[PDB]
Design a protein around this ligand. Structure first.
Ligand code: HEM
Ligand SMILES: CC(=O)[C@H]1CC[C@H]2[C@@H]3CCC4=CC(=O)CC[C@]4(C)[C@H]3CC[C@]12C
Length: 394
């Protein structure tokens, strides 16, 4: 029906290959069928914009088939709106500033402390993964090590949400959720008590006030903070520091002027996105110009196919934090489901990188050890590096 393509599981030492591959595909056809994802990938900007706006035709009901069933992302319409308002409260600008001052700045200093006393470290495992894990730890009131133990299971959960037609991926996702249910239940039970003094405690109290604090709803709060708050945020941090390490003159500008960090992060989401976009379910036969999609089909909206559009972003292969306006991020989705955690993720990248750059004026990539980039790095559902080895001192 649509041309066949292999857009995702392709390794390269070039961080731009992923973005370039999606743009080139979009130039050849508006929709491709990906041989690994097993579903159509929409690449054309106008079609993606139509799809994000029309939730009656492009739903998230495919999440009712997997481990997110019962959670926010699987909800539609008014049910979705009501729970979305609860989540929104916890990610308002002032709430985020409060997390920055109370939790994220001190944690970032502690994570950077642990890198001291070593000539070289891997910023992927030792920084990019560590910081978001410890922030979620703080939100749960549980030791970050307990989350560290779930890494394989977390990635197994996510792989089956994306490759949802692959029986091995779906089975491993459901099994991994089963194998994490004890920890999730323990966290919910403790922070459901009147003695809770954690942010998760506050979220569960708000659900209780709305008579929404079912067993399933409370487990799904915890699940969403793990999958988005820990794992997915790690790769944004990783890709931003890679972009700076790969462009030493820009890294030096940003250490001398930390007010440039928001720009470095936004341009990094364009230049080296950690995500392609979203999944949607076609709810009724629909025509997109001369393209036809059948009711029941699950699709990917690959919003990042526009990142390397040279009419929009001249010299798109250049990491340029001076672009104006800054590029609109495509990694958080769109429409009514646009990532509710995005303010926290953006703030963690800024505060974490600020602490790292201030602490290590000599920071530089290990010249000899080039990272390899792929969608699916380390069995994740992210486009990112396999390692970020650095030298910390001159
Ligand atoms: C770089 C970091 C992150 C990326 C790239 C990301 C990406 C995404 C994407 C693509 C979606 C689906 C949007 C759609 O269907 O339109 C999403 C939804 C969601 N994310 Fe994030 N996420 C990140 C961090 C976070 C964090 C830190 C949290 C929580 C603290 C979080 C919680 C959620 C939730 C609850 C939803 C479902 C929203 C809804 O369906 O209304 N995510 N995220
Ligand atoms: C590939 C990627 O990074 C994106 C594509 C679809 C996104 C997900 C969509 C659903 C979702 C809802 C949550 O509550 C947590 C985050 C998640 C689990 C998202 C994580 C990141 C994902 C997996």
């Amino acid at each position: 029906d649509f041309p066949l393509a292999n857009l995702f599981f392709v390794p390269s030492e070039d961080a731009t290959a992923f973005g370039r591959r999606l743009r080139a595909a979009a130039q050849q056809a508006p929709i491709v069928f990906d041989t690994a994802f097993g579903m159509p990938i929409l690449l054309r900007k106008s079609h993606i914009t139509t799809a994000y706006r029309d939730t009656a035709t492009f739903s998230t009901r495919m999440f009712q088939a997997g481990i997110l069933n019962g959670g926010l992302a699987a909800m539609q319409g008014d049910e979705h709106a009501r729970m979305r308002r609860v989540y929104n409260m916890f990610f308002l600008p002032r709430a985020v500033s409060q997390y920055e001052e109370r939790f994220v700045r001190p944690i970032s200093e502690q994570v950077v402390d642990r890198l001291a006393g070593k000539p070289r470290v891997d910023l992927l495992e030792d920084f990019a993964m560590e910081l978001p894990r410890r922030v979620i730890g703080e939100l749960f009131g549980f030791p970050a090590e307990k989350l560290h133990e779930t890494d394989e299971r977390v990635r197994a959960m996510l792989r089956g949400l994306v490759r949802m037609h692959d029986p091995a991926a779906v089975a491993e996702s459901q099994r991994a959720y089963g194998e994490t249910l004890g920890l999730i239940t323990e966290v919910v039970e403790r922070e459901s008590r009147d003695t809770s003094d954690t942010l998760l405690g506050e979220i569960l109290r708000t659900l209780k006030a709305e008579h929404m604090d079912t067993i399933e709803a409370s487990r799904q709060i915890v699940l969403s903070l793990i999958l988005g708050g820990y794992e997915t945020t790690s790769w944004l941090v990783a890709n931003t520091i890679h972009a700076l390490l790969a462009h030493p003159d820009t890294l030096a500008r940003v250490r001398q002027d930390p007010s440039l960090l928001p720009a470095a992060i936004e341009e990094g989401m364009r230049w080296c996105p950690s995500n392609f976009g979203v999944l949607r379910m076609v709810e009724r036969d629909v025509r997109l110009d001369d393209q036809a999609l059948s009711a029941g089909t699950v699709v990917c909206l690959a919003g990042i196919a526009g990142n390397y559009d040279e009419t929009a972003y001249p010299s798109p292969e250049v990491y340029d934090i001076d672009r104006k306006p800054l590029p609109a991020a495509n990694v958080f989705g769109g429409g009514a489901h646009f990532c509710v955690g995005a303010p926290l993720a953006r703030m963690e990248a800024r505060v974490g990188l600020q602490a790292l750059l201030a602490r290590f004026p000599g920071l530089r990539a290990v010249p000899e050890e080039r990272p390899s980039f792929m969608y699916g790095a380390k069995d994740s559902v992210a486009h990112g590096p396999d390692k970020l080895p650095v030298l910390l001192h001159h």
